[PDB]
Amino acid sequence: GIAIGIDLGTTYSCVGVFQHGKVEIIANDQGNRTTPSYVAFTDTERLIGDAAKNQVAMNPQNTVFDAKRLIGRKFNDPVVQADMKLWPFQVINEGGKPKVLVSYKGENKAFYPEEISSMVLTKLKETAEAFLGHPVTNAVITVPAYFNDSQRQATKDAGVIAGLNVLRIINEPTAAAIAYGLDKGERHVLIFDLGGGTFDVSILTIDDGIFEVKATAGDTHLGGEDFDNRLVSHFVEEFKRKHKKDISQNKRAVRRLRTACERAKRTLSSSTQANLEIDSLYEGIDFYTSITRARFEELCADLFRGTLEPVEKALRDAKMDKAKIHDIVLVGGSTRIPKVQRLLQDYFNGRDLNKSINPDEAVAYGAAVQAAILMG
């Protein structure tokens, strides 16, 4: 009677199981507790997760990501049409629906967004099966609070394609609240979720175990990727200065620099400096340099400070003052950035923020708790 909880994320996904009184977040084969929502196709194999993201600079047309931006939408949806312009892979109109078109084992192959997502789900499921030592056929899968019926259905369909019985589709902010036991009078909770691609602020009221979404706010195109890109621009300028060379138009160079920037960014959450070392970045030139946390914070200052406007807006929409919020929960990997935590804490006049659960694991953690409840 064992079910898993799955955060099927725009940029990173995560799988947990509640067993013998506690949640285990299941690490992938590289030891990472979260997995990139990436699928890549080569002349010989299909790569999912870390191995797919790792080779993105060498196989841009056939490395698919951001399927969550397509899932449950029609090809003619203006959101899809806008997003298509930003991706290196092809999206085609098949019977009114978007399909990503790739080259795989020497043939053209097209996949629905829910098929791409099913591949990510299948990998997560299989990792859980290896961990537990038996099949897993039940799961709770999470979605953004703003998802419509079509998007929820397509996500549930991804689960069925992956061989799961989907016990429930639950909202991400609700899962995060469940992770912290906030459902166990009225309790008002604010979820601040700054991820890899999206920023969501949710206000929930919880009364006798029942959740009501009181307000949602945010930006569907603000996240960690934007911070990586501020670092990229910075280092593009440093390369123009040290070498009189604009690497800006070499797509591979920019991609490899972005990968290095993401790694450096992560390091800056626990250290005040980070080294970048890119062998042969551009014309056999090694690029060895460094970046301080404080410089990184400056480079992103407008974006970090801008996260407080959706907090204000959500509060206004929920007709609540700051002070009336019982609990604030940090979700999303970008909330590990010290400056983001300071900004939010200062906004809330110094109070404690719920962050003891790794913020990039909290959604899966809550999903895992709820999956076990549903099986009981």
Ligand SMILES: Nc1ncnc2c1ncn2[C@@H]1O[C@H](COP(=O)(O)OP(=O)(O)O)[C@@H](O)[C@H]1O
């Ligand atoms: N220690 C860290 N410091 C800063 N950013 C991080 C850290 N760990 C992960 N990230 C970033 O978190 C983002 C992913 O957030 P996550 O919540 O895991 O996924 P999603 O938003 O797709 O659900 C990525 O931009 C990643 O680089």
Ligand SMILES: [Mn+2]
């Ligand atoms: Mn997320």
